[PDB]
Paper text:
We studied a putative BADH from an early MRSA COL isolate, denoted SaBADH, and showed that it is a functional NAD+-dependent BADH that utilizes BA as the primary substrate. BADHs are a group of enzymes from the aldehyde dehydrogenase (ALDH) superfamily that primarily catalyze the oxidation of betaine aldehyde (BA) to betaine; some BADHs also utilize other substrates. BADHs resemble ALDH in structure and are composed of a Rossmann-fold NAD(P)-binding domain, a catalytic (substrate-binding) domain and an oligomerization (bridging) domain. The solution data are supported by the structural analysis and emphasize the importance of the NAD+-driven structural rearrangements at the cofactor-binding and substrate-binding sites for enzymatic activity.
The first peptide stretch adopts a helical conformation extending helix αF in the presence of NAD+ and interacts with the adenine ring of the cofactor. Although this segment is unwound in apo SaBADHBME(+/−), it forms a similar helix turn in apo G234S-SaBADHBME(+/−) and apo SaBADHBME(+)PEG. NAD+ binding results in displacement of the Cα atoms of the second area by ∼1.6–1.9 Å. However, in apo G234S-SaBADHBME(−) and apo SaBADHBME(+)PEG Val288–Ser290 is also repositioned in an NAD-dependent manner. A possible effect of the BME–Cys289 adduct on the loop repositioning in apo SaBADHBME(+)PEG is excluded because the loop is in the apo conformation in apo SaBADHBME(+). Firstly, the adenine ring of NAD+ imposes structural changes on helix αF that were also observed in apo G234S-SaBADHBME(+/−) and apo SaBADHBME(+)PEG. Difference electron-density peaks around the Ala212–Glu215 segment of the helix of these apo structures suggest that this region might be flexible in general and that NAD+ binding selects or induces the favorable conformational state.
Numbering used by the authors:
A (entry chain C): 1 to 496
B (entry chain D): 2 to 496
C (entry chain A), D (entry chain B): 0 to 496
Amino acid sequence: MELLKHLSQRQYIDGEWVESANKNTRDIINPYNQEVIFTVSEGTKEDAERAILAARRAFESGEWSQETAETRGKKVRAIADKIKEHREALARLETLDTGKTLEESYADMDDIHNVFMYFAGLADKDGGEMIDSPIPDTESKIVKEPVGVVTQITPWNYPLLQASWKIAPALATGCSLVMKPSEITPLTTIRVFELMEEVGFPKGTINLILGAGSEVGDVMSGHKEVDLVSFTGGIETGKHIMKNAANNVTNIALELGGKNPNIIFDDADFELAVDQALNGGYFHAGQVCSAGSRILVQNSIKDKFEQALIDRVKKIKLGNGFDADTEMGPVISTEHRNKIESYMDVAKAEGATIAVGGKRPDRDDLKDGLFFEPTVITNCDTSMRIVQEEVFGPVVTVEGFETEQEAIQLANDSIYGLAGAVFSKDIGKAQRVANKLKLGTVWINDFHPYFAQAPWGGYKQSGIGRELGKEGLEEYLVSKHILTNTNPQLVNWFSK
Amino acid sequence: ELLKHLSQRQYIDGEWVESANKNTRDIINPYNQEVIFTVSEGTKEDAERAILAARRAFESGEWSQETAETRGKKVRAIADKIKEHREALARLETLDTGKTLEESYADMDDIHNVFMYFAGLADKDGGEMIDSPIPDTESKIVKEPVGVVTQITPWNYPLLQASWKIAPALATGCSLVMKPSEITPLTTIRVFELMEEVGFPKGTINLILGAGSEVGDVMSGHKEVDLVSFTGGIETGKHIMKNAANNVTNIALELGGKNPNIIFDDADFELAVDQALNGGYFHAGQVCSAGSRILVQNSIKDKFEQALIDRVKKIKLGNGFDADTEMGPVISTEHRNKIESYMDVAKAEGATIAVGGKRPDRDDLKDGLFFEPTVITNCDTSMRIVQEEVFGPVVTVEGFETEQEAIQLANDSIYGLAGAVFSKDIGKAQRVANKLKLGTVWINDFHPYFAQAPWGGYKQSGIGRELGKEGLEEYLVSKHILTNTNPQLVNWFSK
Amino acid sequence: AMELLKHLSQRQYIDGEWVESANKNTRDIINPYNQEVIFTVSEGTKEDAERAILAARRAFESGEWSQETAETRGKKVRAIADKIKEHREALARLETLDTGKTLEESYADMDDIHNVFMYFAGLADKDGGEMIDSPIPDTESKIVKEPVGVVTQITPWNYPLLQASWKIAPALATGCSLVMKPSEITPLTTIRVFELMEEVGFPKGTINLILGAGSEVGDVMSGHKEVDLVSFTGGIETGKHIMKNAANNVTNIALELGGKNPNIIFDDADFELAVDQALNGGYFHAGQVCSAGSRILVQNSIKDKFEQALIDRVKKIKLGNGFDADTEMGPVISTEHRNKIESYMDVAKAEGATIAVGGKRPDRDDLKDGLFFEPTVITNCDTSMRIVQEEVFGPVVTVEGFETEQEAIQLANDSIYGLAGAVFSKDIGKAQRVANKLKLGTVWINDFHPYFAQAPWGGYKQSGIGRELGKEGLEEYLVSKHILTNTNPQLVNWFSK
Amino acid sequence: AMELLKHLSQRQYIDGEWVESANKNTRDIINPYNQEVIFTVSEGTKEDAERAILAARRAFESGEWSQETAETRGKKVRAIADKIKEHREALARLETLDTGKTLEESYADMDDIHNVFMYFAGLADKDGGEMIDSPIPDTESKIVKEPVGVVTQITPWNYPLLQASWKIAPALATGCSLVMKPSEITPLTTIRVFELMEEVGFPKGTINLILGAGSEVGDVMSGHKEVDLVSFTGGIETGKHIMKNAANNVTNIALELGGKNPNIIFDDADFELAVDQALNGGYFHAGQVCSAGSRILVQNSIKDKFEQALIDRVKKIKLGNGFDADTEMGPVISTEHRNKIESYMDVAKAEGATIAVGGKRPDRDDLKDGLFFEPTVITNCDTSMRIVQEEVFGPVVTVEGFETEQEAIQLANDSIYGLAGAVFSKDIGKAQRVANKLKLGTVWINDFHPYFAQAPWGGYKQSGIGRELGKEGLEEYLVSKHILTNTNPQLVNWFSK
Ligand code: NA
Ligand code: NA
Ligand code: NA
Ligand code: NA
């Protein structure tokens, strides 16, 4: 690729592109063919610490934290414009690094532009409140300040998208940040740091660490100079991060995936429900925190639905994300493919049926890549691990339900709470169901939509906090009550 | 006499019940160390049963789907019962905690106002309509009760801290399980009796009594809890947060502070002396926001120290029920011993105990848990006595030269709860206030808090806020409902 | 209620004192059920109104209420709420005696009035303004919300105390001083609420009650230089006059002027529900409701079925005394109003519309002395007609057909009004599409009539200006002030030295 | 700027087309520096204004802009902002040519205008309404915020493009259709911004520009039945007339009418700062500012010192061409306006005040052909005088003394106006006390003149109705609709079956 020839291979710490302190590197792979496409620095825990201290120094200097909100918004808008300027190259880089189709990558770049633009526009819209004090002769106000130094850890599935959800509000509010992308997908994050450097930020305001979570993650979540740890990734890693953050009573924001229900009533638009069940299950080979992996279909149409879904799954076009005909790319890594494979064994052992798929494809052009066939698992129930646990692959389970009440009970019967859908032409019924689902986002007759204007996050074990919207911006602010006594008098409680 | 009718049991799923193992605990009055009452000492199985009842009640919808307006009326009824029983409640609080009766009356007036504020807020939101960027879609954000909440309160202001938690939980439609400090359960039992009189669906409210070491882990680590709200010591709070991580549970923590009281040379001097005493010694300094760290400008430091010391010598110690008392005892033998151990630390580090620093030897104080009001001088920021929260009737005094030095010293702690700036130059006070990393800053005052404004800490003083609209938000969760009003097939996957 | 009258004040309330009219003029108040004089009250002069406004101003400038804490103001408003509930029975009876509506309707009003006061009591201390992130370095920018000032409040005869509560509650919660004048023909419950407010206690001049003819004191109330907001609920022609008067001092105006409210019924509506709600929309309080569903728009496919069902039910509506439990519809308010409704029947027929049922005064012996008018359905009409375009404010509905969803919307929006309306359909998606396109302040989906303190109420187009109820209602009683402090002021040195 | 004119449109913009007046009439535009005709534009008719309003209505109902996503509407408003910055130099020159103010003042306006459009671009998609916790079981209650509808916008001659931006930005951000008419004497930058908006692209009829006499088209713009909001910035007498016309259709009005703005200087103010800011308050744009500090209130203890210092500086103010870098104050806007200012000097003297300096046209050769009026200080005056009570809107200040903080507040509030004012004192607590008591929409503490898009601007009392700028400014362009859905509808069964 033309693009890689000019892309930085280094970390960005305190205004400089720097190698790892130990000079180590890591080879980055294209999951389509398992070929090494780039080599980047693999940073140390001391590099992460230096970045955090630089972020703290920059925060205390006030160069960004005391800049006007209006000016901060103009700089965030400049980032947005660079994303659009470089839309094609960024999308290509994301497809090369993550394997998803170019069309999916273009959608991400449009969303990223809009995320930065939304937060640019929100930057100067709310500085706090005046309170009508209950104490005569006092003035009470609540001022909103940037939370401080923030550490930000992003996942491999949508690297630049998830990075934008964190960077945009942090910069808009005046925070300093240290970001570490997934060790296996750093390309677009490196590129966005180049673009941010072009816009221009005070030294130490933005920092990029590259490397293994196992090497630098503990410093990023446990350092005393951090005010907020924002992590998007796996549940076990998230819980560890939160336990680390507790050592300094540090604010945490977590987005950890889900077991997202796709509820299809017998009065759904049937062909729409089939289309959206495929979309829910198989976009990005199901490697989506909000993938519709748990299909709940009304008993009366269950057989019809399974036959239609299976017939379509057999036609899904696997291939290179750069090829126009491809509908589904490979999964991200050998380890991840192996995990998906292990879940097939679990499903069968529990008594479920692998109705279609469940193996690596044999076709010659797919043999060198990390492909896994789109899969439908039938004859399963809520007690099963395959239904309860997040596989994060191109796999859906299908369960039947008899009544609206049973659909709700089954949908809520998981440890998760991120997103889900209800399909029915009876909008009143869909609305009743939506109000009873313990999910951060519920779609009525759709699957997948998210946008900067609305908060995204989970109930239960799917996370803590929200990203996007006004609530997303609030994670990056802290409230201070300043109370002035305008006619102070001695209390005279203690003897004189 | 009040005690003769007070319940001795836990309240679980609409019934007053003993501990599952029939264990009990004797409650002590710190003024004389006498046993005043005996209550059930619950088990982790009792706490679990309460959590499961709260969950069942939440899912039934009897409270969670009640109208917000009606929920507000019930919260207002609790407020009115607090006022109705103000006398008895104040007396119980002084008996249990040792603070003066006048301090307890002030608490009861505040508690009435906390409930009343949240009663009035209950029906004032609901969420937002969003202008969706996707044509032919409707986007709304609904605010729902967070769910089942566990609430753990401290021994210093038991009913006040209980009200900060109960009021928004009930206003929003949550179910709750509360556990007061094992050593100070009396007013919390009484408020449960009063809430039962108001009337709530079975399982909506539950009271567990017992050791944090026995039931705290289940209250913070149970899968059916959606929010853990804890007010207490830093080490316990960290543990609670680690437990809450097991189920990715929301946490709200209020953990105390090392709160600065910054006195400039242009402060109203007698006001600053009065407020330094108030900051340091109300409730024998057992206040999350006590002004234990006095920072005074160098040019008036000597004058200030002499004035403060002279006043400290006159502070009247005694029974909280006696009107002349200005400062009562500290809470327990263990707590007094901890304060005593800090005096040893201070001297070993090279600081000066300028006045106090020991138990008083006056006949009427000998049987109680008294500790003299104390001033520590000749200390600096590197010392443990300056950095660590003693939570007793002790203040340190450090000098500073410039406004910049005052800010640097004030911010040089792991904490961030509250603090004050005293200066007749309001512009200067405002500049300092904007630079202090504290949840509340008072200009020419010390101690004020109220339901209308959020309270909480930066840094290691906590996570989240109590009081105000932000306090209510801890008890809500957002749901984005997106309806596609003209759905079309995407036709991405081949047919 | 006649026993309640033995203790009710007959006077105005000005600057903390119950006072008669300056010229000792009075007015006899009538019960519309039997046209009997039930009470006599003071009929104030324009000088009395001026004295009340000046007292309100003096009180406002003293700060005793305007600078009271918001939390305390809220407690006082809550005290009023509690008095409404305490006196629910007597107030409901007084309202039925004065206005003629059923006692059950009056009880519902009193429950609502309690909730209005309680809502605003709870809202009183929940704002104060905002801190702005200033774009100018070394400045502090804040927006403080203050009471608007002195407010004049003019209420209608249909729901006197309810409409009074909508104005009084936010005015007191925010710290304004007010001067209220109820409809000259229905002052009873307003006098009573002033007695109750006095019991709670407010600073002298904070609340004032003028009694009398809009033709005598209305110009002073809308045109005085010391007034900051004129809030009027009533007829369109009077409202326009009030607004023109208010312009003389560039005074804020809040107006609620009624409507021609559509009740849109699709062929997939729950049919019996739609018939029930069309009756409710048309005939509660004899149709004397700002939001009455006087304009029924029914899908052509079910128009004949609907008209027959509605007409059959209208024939069964029970007319009588509002105090009698069997009564479903009381009389209209006055001779003048009944005559106006009657004149509309002539207009309808001359335009070619059909009076399908009703359209006259009833003859029954027990109804002959009262101001009764039969519930009426007008059919075979179209949007070009005066009977369809103009607000009759009586127990009368028109019925028009529509073919499509698009035509329903076009017809519903083809009026000068914009207050409220409904859409009936089991297809909630369709109902939502229609609701988004109706130019109305409130749209009900599968309901008719609901309003409550938590949500703003008011009209698009000629139905009004501004909103009452909700947070927006409170905002009518506030004014914003931007205070900008330069914390490091420097000379500009633009002009030569 | 004369080269810029060679490419500038001379026509109105109606329903997507640049068009002449229906009667082919034109108007010559003058440069106040030399009274030379610099451009000739169409002078539209009342039928042109009506056609624009009908086009705006048609466009609104088509939904092309009103139903466009808020995010996309914001992007288009941002595009306007970027064009203002792109064309900053030419626009600033055009504004100085048309209005006479200094080029440096015009550059500052263009920077502000960019920021106004950018603020509203960023606000466009940040609301939408509220979800309400309904008090009725089994109902859903929401408040949707919609564009108000069709808006007419009338701007003043002092800051034409700035005032235009305050109106255009929120109207387009919210999805309204608009019809704008700039001051007949200063249309240049408004024509230019319409060219720039056309480049960005809006649906046909969404934006319209009428050019002409308020006396010819103002009545249609304020009195047409298809208008939902009339937004006017200008003189008090015209504003009152506009409000009275708007009343004919119960149309929302937003007015900004100027003020008698106090500049309060305590004896503990930074003295040289107060002198600098008194000059700035009085004489920027030759005092032709809605918020000019024309009414100086100075503590008696320093009044003599202050008057002498102010007068000595006023004598040094440099008058000249706004294009010349040394000029500090340009000419006034027109012959009629200069004559009005002159007539006030006669009034002042007849009332017993002293013209301490200025009060006449300057004689210098390079100023003789222009509409210059000397910077003037009037002393020995009091609150009872017309010169103190009435807005001159020229390069003139009055000076009155006060003894105490209480007297400063009483005098400052003793006018019919309520737009802006300042308090100068190093005692910030005192300045805050005074600021809280001044009945003014904006109060500056130790500053004079600041305004910005982030904070609302507008007047108490006769200075206006409503606010421009900030979130409140956006709200003038929105309307609330309460949609209440009954999710389990049941028959009421009130009326007999
Ligand atoms: Na969670
Ligand atoms: Na913290
Ligand atoms: Na209107
Ligand atoms: Na006004």
